[PDB]
């Protein structure tokens, strides 16, 4: 009734509460994005290329 009437759901005291802990499903470190993979590749490449120009001069 409270939800269908848009009243404070918290007013109804739950009979009991339970805490479930979720410690993260393992997907690896969050670098596995195709766009980001190019971002790290290009970022590294730009520094490397500049280093080359630093040597060639």
């Amino acid at each position: 009734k409270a939800q269908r009437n848009n009243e404070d759901i918290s007013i109804i005291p739950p009979l009991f509460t339970v805490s479930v802990d979720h410690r993260g499903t393992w997907n690896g470190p969050w670098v596995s994005t195709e766009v980001l993979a190019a971002a790290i590749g290009l970022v590294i490449y730009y520094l490397a290329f500049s280093a080359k120009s630093h040597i060639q001069a």
Partner: protein, 117 residues
């Protein structure tokens, strides 16, 4: 730095800016502040592209080639503006304004470095 390496470096910097602008075009146009941020990026693309074009001209036609208002300067400005339109119409004013401000100082820098020497 060497002219041949310099041409590649300018091209790389301009290319990277253009690719990033397209990738985040939707985000950049979402808000007025982000569109203004696009204006800074577009001007930077113009500056690097102009440097690359002059470097290429020097290598093909010999060192000391002088860039003119037309078509070398005009073409570089046009390319930067075209990228600005893709993200949003609004930048064409801001993206253009930043490019002009950079151009005046860049010419001032070039005159001191080359004419004095």
């Amino acid at each position: 730095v060497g002219t041949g390496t310099s041409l590649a470096l300018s091209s790389l910097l301009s290319l990277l800016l253009f690719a990033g602008m397209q990738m985040y075009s939707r985000q950049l146009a979402s808000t007025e502040w982000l569109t203004i941020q696009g204006g800074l990026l577009g001007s930077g693309l113009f500056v690097f592209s102009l440097t690359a074009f002059n470097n290429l001209e020097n290598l093909v036609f010999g060192k000391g080639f002088q860039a003119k208002i037309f078509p070398e300067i005009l073409l570089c400005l046009l390319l930067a503006l075209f990228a600005s339109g893709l993200i949003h119409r609004v930048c064409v004013t801001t993206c253009f304004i930043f490019s002009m401000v950079g151009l005046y100082y860049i010419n001032k820098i070039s005159s001191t470095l080359y004419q004095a020497a």
